[PDB]
Amino acid sequence: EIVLTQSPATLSLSPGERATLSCRASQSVSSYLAWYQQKPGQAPRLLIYDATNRATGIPARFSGSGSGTDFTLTISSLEPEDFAVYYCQHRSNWPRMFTFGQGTKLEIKRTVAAPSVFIFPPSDEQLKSGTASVVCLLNNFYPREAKVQWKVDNALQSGNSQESVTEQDSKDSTYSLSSTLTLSKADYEKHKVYACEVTHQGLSSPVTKSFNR
Amino acid sequence: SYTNSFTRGVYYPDKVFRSSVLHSTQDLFLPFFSNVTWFHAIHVSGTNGTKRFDNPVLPFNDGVYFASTEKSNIIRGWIFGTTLDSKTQSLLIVNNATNVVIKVCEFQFCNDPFLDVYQKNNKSWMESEFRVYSSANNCTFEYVSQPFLMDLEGKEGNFKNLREFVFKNIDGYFKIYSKHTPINLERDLPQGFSALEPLVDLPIGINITRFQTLLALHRSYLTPGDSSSGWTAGAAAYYVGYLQPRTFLLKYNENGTITDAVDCALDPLSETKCTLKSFTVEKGIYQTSNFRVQPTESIVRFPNITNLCPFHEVFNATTFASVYAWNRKRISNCVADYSVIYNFAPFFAFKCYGVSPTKLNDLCFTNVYADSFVIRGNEVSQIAPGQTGNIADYNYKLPDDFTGCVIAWNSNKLDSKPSGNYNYLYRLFRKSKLKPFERDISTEIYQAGNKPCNGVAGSNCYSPLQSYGFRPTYGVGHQPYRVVVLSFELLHAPATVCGPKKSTNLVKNKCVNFNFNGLTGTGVLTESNKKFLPFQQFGRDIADTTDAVRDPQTLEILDITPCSFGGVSVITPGTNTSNQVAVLYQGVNCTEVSNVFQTRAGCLIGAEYVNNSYECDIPIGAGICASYQTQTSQSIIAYTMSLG
Amino acid sequence: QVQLVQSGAEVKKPGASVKVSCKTSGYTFTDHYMYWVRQAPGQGLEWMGVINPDAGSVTYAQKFQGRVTMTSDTSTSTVYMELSSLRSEDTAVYYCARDLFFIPAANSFDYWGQGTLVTVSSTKGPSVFPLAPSSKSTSGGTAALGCLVKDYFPEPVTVSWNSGALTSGVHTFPAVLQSSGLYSLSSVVTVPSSSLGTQTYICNVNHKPSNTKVDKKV
């Protein structure tokens, strides 16, 4: 089928400017395309259908255009209620095989915030259960770009760490990242030094927080 | 006279390209090693001096293999026709200089179509005089064909010009084939394989049972003294073949050309290579019973039609509603028959925007929505995919993917009435633009500008209705035209309306390929008085072979006998040694159709029983053994195996 | 107003069938097509598929192609969708969408439902573990308190602090599917270092499917 692919997939702009998200294809879909808008936590709404005309209940700022094998959306002025994920879908006539793309996230452009690195050792109550989980906290920072490194006695560990990134806050447009290294009680008591290395664009040098058991 | 066409008569059946495949098709080809009607077209001069020539009315049964060895202008035309009395369309393919005048006209030209050469080398001259034809009637089809339908001639010591034309009697196209190939010898027979590519395909249809060739008269000056006896050596000789339905196995080459062919029928070696699919046949039995030739006819279709869908009352009823309340009628759980539509009345615009009208009965449809409505006379085409009309934007609108039809006709006889005609409306005033297949049956007062119109309407406000005055004195453009659009949706589902499956008239007592209600096979259909159960449709014998089937049409019982003639076998000693082969019809006493010897297992045709005893080379059966020995010039012999 | 109401939550097992309904309202359910779209966590819309309101005229997708049956019903005007043999990759939020066009044609989706979080796993009980910061973790005069909840697959948990009295600086991370098949997330809150030891902070964990309420003091 028609592999609808979107090139940018991440359009970081500021509220007030104009945006142009592209979604190209292969076959002639000049008059066969739809535009959606899926905010996190609700259902996707129809943004632009038929790729040329405006839908109902849509503000005048949303204006779409394009023909052939190259389409794009032309937003007039970005608003706080506009930052969401947008998709594209064509209407195949004979074989009903409506396909979608991948989505483009619209972020808010601000200053480069520095990630506040915090590390939390596992409490004795969790150690009594036989499990150990060290949490490395990364709050109030620019778009997730901080790969988390776990060093146990200067030895790099991989495969046993899980990362969780929150959505963009509506108050300060910052992000939060939490890394949890799950280890057994024996492996936890076997070693002494545990470190969390953070490398982010806002940091001139990698900041590593470590503690001694 | 007669001749033998060794391996000539093969052409490309279809236009599909193929490479390195061995496909077998059932068409009308020329059988190998046949008796082609050899006719030497030369001058005949009698004792009295009257010039004469042979020109019989050769019958065009189903096709010919007309070849020609003309030098310059001896054979430059053909004549086709079944009546030749101004009753059917003829075909005069005038192969003039640098062009070919293909004229399909119905008239009676003459009985002896004579024509001279008149080798005028002038660029502006007509060689086809008015002596060939004398009548002039309405012609159905004609063509110019700027590339002349004639091969190039060569001038050399012994390299002559060879060409052949394969014609058929297909109702769709004439299937004209042409190919040129130079010969290398002057005294050897043209033994070789040369396929013919389709040159032109005239889309004309007419019954043709006979044909006539167009030779050159060239009797301007007989030059007495040198041609007193007519002719000595020979000017040209045209061959006349006859195609027969056969299952030819074609072998395509790497570049996509036919280098050889297998008859698969009427020939023991061809039948062996067909049933074994190998050229170098080994020493085996290789039974090929019930698969030899069996060409008779072609009757294959699905019987047992059923309840017709309610297409009526949508093309012919009492009164159709306007575009205001256009009626909808879905059609499901039935099989559509798009043949009674045309019988209603001569239409005005049969423009199906999604499929071809001749292809409606070739695919299944989920549900057809029949929407009928009466409109004005100058808007018959406004209701079409992508059209912005006052009755196509604020009323029933078609989308950009309408895979249906816009069938419409004139109703100036049923819907016309000498009155005010307050029956129909069109509702020109509408708030928004109607989406595809949107029906608005509301009567709210329209309001364009700022004007409160709750109670009644004034000047700024309008009513969503207007009388569609259809006066009988009005001409085309203001007459009531009934339009019905059959919306053909495409959903992969248990579709019902596939097509009007209509079988043939149940041919019997004839060995044809039968396909009745799913089951497909071959054999003969005979009469049988078997009392089958009312719910049983298929029948099987004790040997799991289809012996009788219930007619899906009106109550009748048939009996499908295979005609397996026991078991047709064939012995081949290998193509590497020689090509002589023999057939053993196991289960035949040499009476149910050359050396003939009856064995204990069957009738061996193609070998002689030798009283001597040798080693068993090819196991025949019941002690019989065959081999290929140099008997005193080698042929397959038959003998009893030596046990010691 | 046209408002398509759907079901709530639904848990299942590998190799089963889930029945999710999406009732229509406001408009006459005889003319507008309905589609069923899947939204995977983190991914986008995946499959199409239309169900005819009048008859059984359906069109399933190419990925499934036989393992889904979309029925129709004109009595209560409600559609159904029974996906068969749910695997570990079918856990998503299924939606029901209408069309701007009528029965014959179909351009796009305009009216959507509310979703239905269908998942495939084994149910169990949750567990809460407090996360206490070290004495050397005080950087920039601020401190972070956290609570690590674990062993719970469903995610309706709303980790509130002091019964919702503390809302500034509270960050609730999304749940992550562990290797054992159970989700777990942590909730952190930034508090000044001067408030350490003087103010009592209690993280309130509530799990409705298991009816478990645990208040852990930090």
Residue numbers in the entry:
A (entry chain L): 1 to 213
B (entry chain A): 28 to 620, 640 to 678, 689 to 700
C (entry chain H): 1 to 218
The article reads:
To understand the broad neutralization mechanism of PW5-5, we determined the cryo-EM structure of PW5-5 complexed with the stabilized prefusion ectodomain of Omicron XBB S (6 P) and SARS-CoV S (2 P), respectively. Cryo-EM characterization revealed three conformational states of XBB S–PW5-5 complex: the XBB S trimer with two up-RBDs binding two PW5-5 Fabs (state 1), the XBB S trimer with three up-RBDs binding two PW5-5 Fabs (state 2), and the XBB S monomer with one PW5-5 Fab (state 3), with resolution ranging from 3.1 Å to 3.7 Å. The structure of monomer XBB S–PW5-5 was at sufficient resolution for model building. PW5-5 binds to a covert epitope inside the RBD, burying a 936 Å2 surface area. In total, 16 RBD residues are involved in the interaction. Among these, D54 of CDRH2 and R91 of CDRL3 form salt bridges with R357 and D428 of RBD, respectively. Y33 of CDRH1, N52, D54, S57, T59 of CDRH2, F102 of CDRH3, Y32 of CDRL1, Y49 of CDRL2 and N93 of CDRL3 form ten pairs of hydrogen bonds with E516, Y396, H519, P463, D427, D428 and K462. In addition, Y33, V50, V58 of CDRH2, F101, F102, P104, A105 of CDRH3 and W94 of CDRL3 form a hydrophobic patch with F464, P426, P463, L517, L518, A520 and P521 of RBD. The binding epitope of PW5-5 are highly overlapped with FD20 and S2H97, hidden in the inner side of highly conserved RBD, including the key epitopes R355, R357, K462, and P463 covered by both FD20 and S2H97, as well as the key residue E465 involved in the formation of three hydrogen bonds in FD20 epitopes. PW5-5 strengthened the binding force between the antibody and S protein through a large number of hydrogen bonds and hydrophobic interactions, and the binding epitopes were narrow, so it could better cope with mutations.
